[PDB]
Amino acid sequence: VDTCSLASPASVCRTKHLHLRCSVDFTRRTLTGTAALTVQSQEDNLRSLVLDTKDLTIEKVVINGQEVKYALGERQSYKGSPMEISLPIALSKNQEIVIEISFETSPKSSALQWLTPEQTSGKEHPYLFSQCQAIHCRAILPCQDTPSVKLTYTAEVSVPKELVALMSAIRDGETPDPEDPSRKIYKFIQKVPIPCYLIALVVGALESRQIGPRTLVWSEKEQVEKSAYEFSETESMLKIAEDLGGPYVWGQYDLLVLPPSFPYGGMENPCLTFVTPTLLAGDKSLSNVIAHEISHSWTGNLVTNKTWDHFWLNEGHTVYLERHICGRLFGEKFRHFNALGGWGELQNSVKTFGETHPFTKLVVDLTDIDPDVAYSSVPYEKGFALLFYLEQLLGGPEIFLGFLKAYVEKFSYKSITTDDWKDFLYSYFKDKVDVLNQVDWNAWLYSPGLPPIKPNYDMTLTNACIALSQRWITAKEDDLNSFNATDLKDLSSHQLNEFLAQTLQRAPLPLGHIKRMQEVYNFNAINNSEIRFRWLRLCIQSKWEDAIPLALKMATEQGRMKFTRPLFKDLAAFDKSHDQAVRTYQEHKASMHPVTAMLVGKDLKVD
Numbered sequence: 001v002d003t004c005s006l007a008s009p010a011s012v013c014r015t016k017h018l019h020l021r022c023s024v025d026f027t028r029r030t031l032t033g034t035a036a037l038t039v040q041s042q043e044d045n046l047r048s049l050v051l052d053t054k055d056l057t058i059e060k061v062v063i064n065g066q067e068v069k070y071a072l073g074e075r076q077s078y079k080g081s082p083m084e085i086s087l088p089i090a091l092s093k094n095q096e097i098v099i100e101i102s103f104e105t106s107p108k109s110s111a112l113q114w115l116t117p118e119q120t121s122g123k124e125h126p127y128l129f130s131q132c133q134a135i136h137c138r139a140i141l142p143c144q145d146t147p148s149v150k151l152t153y154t155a156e157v158s159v160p161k162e163l164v165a166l167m168s169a170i171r172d173g174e175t176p177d178p179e180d181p182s183r184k185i186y187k188f189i190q191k192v193p194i195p196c197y198l199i200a201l202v203v204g205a206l207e208s209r210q211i212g213p214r215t216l217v218w219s220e221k222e223q224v225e226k227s228a229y230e231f232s233e234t235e236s237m238l239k240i241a242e243d244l245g246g247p248y249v250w251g252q253y254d255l256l257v258l259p260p261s262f263p264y265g266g267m268e269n270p271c272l273t274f275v276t277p278t279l280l281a282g283d284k285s286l287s288n289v290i291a292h293e294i295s296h297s298w299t300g301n302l303v304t305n306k307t308w309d310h311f312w313l314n315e316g317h318t319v320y321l322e323r324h325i326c327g328r329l330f331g332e333k334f335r336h337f338n339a340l341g342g343w344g345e346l347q348n349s350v351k352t353f354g355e356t357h358p359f360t361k362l363v364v365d366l367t368d369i370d371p372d373v374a375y376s377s378v379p380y381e382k383g384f385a386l387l388f389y390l391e392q393l394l395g396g397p398e399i400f401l402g403f404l405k406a407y408v409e410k411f412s413y414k415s416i417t418t419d420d421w422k423d424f425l426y427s428y429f430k431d432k433v434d435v436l437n438q439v440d441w442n443a444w445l446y447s448p449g450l451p452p453i454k455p456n457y458d459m460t461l462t463n464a465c466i467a468l469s470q471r472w473i474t475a476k477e478d479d480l481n482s483f484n485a486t487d488l489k490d491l492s493s494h495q496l497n498e499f500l501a502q503t504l505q506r507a508p509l510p511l512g513h514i515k516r517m518q519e520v521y522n523f524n525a526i527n528n529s530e531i532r533f534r535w536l537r538l539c540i541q542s543k544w545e546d547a548i549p550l551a552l553k554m555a556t557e558q559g560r561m562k563f564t565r566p567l568f569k570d571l572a573a574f575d576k577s578h579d580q581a582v583r584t585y586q587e588h589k590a591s592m593h594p595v596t597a598m599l600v601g602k603d604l605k606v607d
Ligand SMILES: N[C@@H](CC(=O)O)Cn1nnc(-c2ccc(Oc3ncc(Cl)cc3F)cc2)n1
Pocket: 133, 134, 264, 265, 266, 267, 268, 292, 293, 296, 308, 309, 311, 312, 315, 364, 366, 371, 372, 374, 375, 376, 379
């Protein structure tokens, strides 16, 4: 059962198609229009159905050209309000009907961020973007807001003519709006069935540059050139991902570089991956995020988790595929380095929640839990650790990659549970069932904390990071003069980041050590968002007051939650910056992404 949805489940009825016709009004901060749902009954004598909605204004519901009775139930917190539709005629099993719902979004839709021109690069035009994952599609349109249901979609979007609309679909033309010549209509088609959290929309002053045979990069004009360079390896990654997962079925693989308030590193929207502008390091060093989003074209978008309790199926397999792409491009020692880094991020998450916390379990129970509050590195890294452990136990990467491809083939276009995955693993590895029966499944899948077994990792690229970090941690005041810019000469940006991660795990360090690190390494000058984030966290946790304006600036000038949430939390925990952290959040709250605003609010205990 999907405990995050209030809609009729897949066993009652299934949405087969959505035909969306809407208009974006920037003055009212509203999306208005019709969502035409092609619903197939899965039951005999079906006379009503329930849809998920959240802060939607419903005008009418039309079936067979006539208005039908509908009712909106009491709001159930983050789940929204259930919408019961009275069908005009009882439906037999497998019978299909079209339900056209006239709706309007609230300006406070948790799925959307409305940007004023001042909040964009260009400063002349407003901007809109959606983020439906996990359960925010119900805050845009009435739907069965569950990944257990997959549907195709077509969309027609009216926007002011000076702007461009894009969706998680194939672009299907543009025309002047026949109802308003100050507007344009942008058309879209998604022929591959998808869960509704993969529905996405962006409206802004967008420009494009071709960077591959099936890839355009999209952003405001100011970011196009930098984005084209940063993501130039995209086609190479797609070719490797196809070799590992089978055919790319989505047609196009475009990239959209969002404004800095985009709350995640990326979003695997089909045909149009969304990315944070914090990836624009200038040297392609944060491109693993692209490898991760590309990998989702197989794991997550083709093979989907049936409910959000099984989310690890989505991320664990994606991180696994992502690390193989980087492994093919830069070698097996690099894949091991990234895997070990991943284990360290898992240690961090387990330490933050506490080793007995229910969110440290691989398979979770989201009954009465807002998925946004549960979000962490655990399904990513505990999920990856399991697969990497299975890879070693079952004979190596080549053998395990054979399983990955067969798993994708077996479950493409379906929504599955952990039991479905485990059953297939046992079927594929029938000749190694004795090895599989040695796995402590109850601990790996259902127990909190660190996994019962840690995999084996090649140390070649990690050794220099640990050695430098340990030199700083063990150093006394009279050893600080020995550090010099030459200590970093043989370290890649990835190794610099790992050195900071290792040191941050032992934070605080004495204030004199942090001051010396800046003196000799000039970390303040580094623009790479990952390195800068860890360096600022290290400064704040080591109580360096000079870092307060830098940390406040980074936390607010961008909104990627991975950075913004721990920076605000570190600033709130430092006595010297506590008041500034709270006040800065209060003054920025209204201009923030709604999900980021909620979570920073909870982290700071500011209601
Ligand atoms: N897809 C990513 C980027 C990427 O990985 O490529 C972007 N992204 N956007 N939203 C989310 C997201 C995912 C799960 C959420 O909820 C849950 N979190 C943990 C568990 Cl165990 C179960 C849940 F349901 C809430 C939000 N992820």
